[PDB]
Amino acid sequence: SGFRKMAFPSGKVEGCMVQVTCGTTTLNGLWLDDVVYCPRHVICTSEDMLNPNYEDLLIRKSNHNFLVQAGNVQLRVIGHSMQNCVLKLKVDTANPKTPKYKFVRIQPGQTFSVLACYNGSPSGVYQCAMRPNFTIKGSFLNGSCGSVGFNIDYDCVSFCYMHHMELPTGVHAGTDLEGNFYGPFVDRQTAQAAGTDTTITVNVLAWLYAAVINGDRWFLNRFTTTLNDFNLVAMKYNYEPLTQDHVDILGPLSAQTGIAVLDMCASLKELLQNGMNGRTILGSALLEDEFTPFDVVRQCSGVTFQ
Amino acid sequence: SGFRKMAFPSGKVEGCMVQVTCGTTTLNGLWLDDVVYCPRHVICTSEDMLNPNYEDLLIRKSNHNFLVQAGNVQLRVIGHSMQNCVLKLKVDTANPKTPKYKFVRIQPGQTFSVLACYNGSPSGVYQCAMRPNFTIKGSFLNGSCGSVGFNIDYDCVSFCYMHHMELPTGVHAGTDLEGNFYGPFVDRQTAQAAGTDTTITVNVLAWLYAAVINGDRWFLNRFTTTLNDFNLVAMKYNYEPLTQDHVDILGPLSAQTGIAVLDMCASLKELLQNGMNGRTILGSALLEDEFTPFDVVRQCSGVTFQ
């Protein structure tokens, strides 16, 4: 029992972190096989960043200008290319600790672990959700750029996020590992704001199932609802629409607990309409939306990784 | 910016986890150099656990009865001994991934990361506090015993916790790495309850400093208080006494923000007396007590590990 915000074990990713320095600029990179992936703005000074022409800055660089360090050891760069907002540095040594891996673009509502790094060294690990507005509520300082986010499935690391920037209200934005931003953001120091965020309904329901499994059951009511009527209420409280696909994904938890999804929706509707009245669910005084159905099952069933 | 419950990177510990099987009982062990450390109740069946005589059970075992597996590979056991509630299995192979490490007994109020493991494989990592009542609010299932808790300081892993059991209300209890329990608990399946818990005052103050550093400043009032008067109020709300040592430990955060500790105490007193009135601090609707002053500084200053 118990339910915690749990991150994936970070060791497979720790073995891939390096430092990339170009001129006076240093950030983190990810070394897989013989390639180092990092934010392209390693080639910028704190003056180029107001309106940089990356293509222009890069043509004036050559391989030797990129100083890549894995711990002590310098990796010799033997090629470079830009892909969207990431640079790929081909190095002359393959990383012997490279895990089985994939690059995936995640969808809003999905979670992942972040390994926050500075100067190529890991500081800590935490779990994040890709928010509906394509930001993450991270914890990142100067020097954190090139830190990555990931999921693990058995032995395979799915890298889904590389960190680039901090927006107003202290939320974060970055790219997939092909250098395409999540959301409408650009890698330049210019006025940018996140869209209004929404609550990830399916994750809230997942977490309510987690509460039932842990014996926190006070909020279950005796009613059901239709999907349609549920969505009209959710809408008012700035919850995302619940789709049939979401219902289908909640099927395992529904089967385990014997609570139909639309019955749990009726309980959620009452929490939204009446509040929690000073009570907690799983220790929390607010409804939590950063656990996916899979996160709940993984945690409550003891799924392990290689 | 941003503030998250952040765990240490787990890789150094992942490289030390193994599976120990005795008879039909399997739990996790920790392999450092040529020793495997695990809960002594690996030698028990689900019948011996009501009132086990460990000394008696152990004398009937020999080295070969302990099946130790590191991934695929079986490690040959060449000696065994019991120390308090842990077994130490001497094996014929030194773990080549052993980090620099120490065994430490932590104090109530201190935090650490848990690497939750099943069958010798890691499932996830999260941060925990040793509660004043010597429990932790963990997330552990059947098969999690022998999972460890740890801190990292640069290159050195301080192991402070090995998991043994779950108490009523879904909280957890275990030992240091010399097999001595935290709190009054015993490794037997018998009626045991945690003492009433208390809020870790110094950690709450630490977290309020974290809020100020992140620009969440609404709760700062214009007053100060004495330590004595603060402690009379804290007492009523089941907060631990704040000592001068606690004040001294908050000195770095106080200096950084320019808010005297007793001024922050006055703000805390008002939160305790009046509540948060529906507002949040760092996204939380309750006062949080599982961040130490050091955790705040580590996270807000970007301290990294080897």
Ligand SMILES: *[C@@](O)(c1nc2cc(Cl)ccc2s1)[C@H](C[C@@H]1CCNC1=O)NC(=O)[C@@H]1[C@@H]2[C@H](CN1C(=O)[C@@H](NC(=O)C(F)(F)F)C(C)(C)C)C2(C)C
């Ligand atoms: C990185 O770690 C990077 N730092 C540098 C420094 C130099 Cl000289 C070159 C390239 C990089 S990448 C940080 C992480 C930030 C810092 C604070 N917290 C974080 O998460 N990234 C940045 O500094 C990026 C970088 C330029 C600006 N920037 C920002 O995050 C801006 N944000 C914005 O302008 C806004 F649009 F998002 F809001 C701030 C104001 C400095 C936080 C670029 C976007 C390329």
Ligand SMILES: *[C@@](O)(c1nc2cc(Cl)ccc2s1)[C@H](C[C@@H]1CCNC1=O)NC(=O)[C@@H]1[C@@H]2[C@H](CN1C(=O)[C@@H](NC(=O)C(F)(F)F)C(C)(C)C)C2(C)C
């Ligand atoms: C371990 O993983 C262990 N499991 C086994 C199984 C066998 Cl056959 C032998 C030895 C061990 S150690 C679990 C972890 C628990 C299970 C649920 N969540 C967890 O954290 N530990 C236990 O099962 C320990 C073990 C015997 C009982 N026990 C318990 O946790 C009891 N708790 C208590 O009796 C109480 F006093 F704490 F409350 C419960 C009721 C089974 C949870 C011993 C204490 C040696």
